[PDB]
């Protein structure tokens, strides 16, 4: 029931994408950096998934430029054929932003579902 950090990890999926953020003072998608966007299911002791994250480090550098868990209040649209917004956690505990994902038309598409499916099973966990 309790997140540790020490969970196992299975990663979804892998894919190669732009990543944007939107600047709420200039009102336009800020480039963050590109690479692989990862989307991992963090394992308990039990197998449960006790959450999901999308996290994605910018080539050459590395830097961390996306860290965050999914939760069943999510905001997800397909934007394009290519894109995909969304609302998540920033990475140095700075609050929620809205972020653009842009690749193929092939990985957006399953990107999508993944986490669409995730989002409607988190709001399945009520007791
Ligand atoms: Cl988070």
């Given at each position: 029931?309790?997140?540790?950090?020490?969970?196992?990890?299975?990663?979804?999926?892998?894919?190669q994408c732009?990543l944007?953020?939107?600047?709420?003072?200039?009102?336009?998608?800020?480039?963050?950096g590109r690479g692989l966007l990862?989307?991992?299911?963090?394992?308990?002791?039990?197998?449960?998934?006790?959450?999901?994250?999308?996290?994605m480090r910018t080539q050459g550098?590395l830097?961390?430029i996306?860290?965050?868990?999914?939760?069943?209040?999510?905001?997800?649209?397909?934007?394009?054929?290519?894109?995909?917004?969304?609302?998540?956690?920033?990475?140095?505990?700075?609050?929620?932003?809205?972020?653009?994902?842009?690749?193929?038309?092939?990985?957006?598409?399953?990107?999508?579902?993944?986490?669409?499916?995730?989002?409607?099973?988190?709001?399945?966990?009520?007791?």
């Amino acid at each position: 029931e309790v997140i540790t950090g020490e969970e196992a990890e299975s990663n979804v999926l892998q894919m190669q994408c732009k990543l944007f953020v939107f600047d709420k003072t200039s009102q336009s998608w800020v480039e963050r950096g590109r690479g692989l966007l990862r989307l991992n299911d963090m394992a308990s002791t039990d197998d449960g998934t006790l959450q999901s994250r999308l996290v994605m480090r910018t080539q050459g550098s590395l830097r961390l430029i996306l860290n965050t868990k999914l939760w069943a209040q999510m905001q997800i649209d397909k934007a394009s054929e290519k894109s995909i917004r969304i609302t998540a956690m920033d990475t140095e505990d700075q609050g929620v932003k809205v972020f653009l994902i842009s690749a193929s038309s092939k990985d957006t598409g399953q990107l999508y579902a993944a986490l669409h499916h995730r989002i409607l099973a988190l709001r399945s966990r009520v007791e």
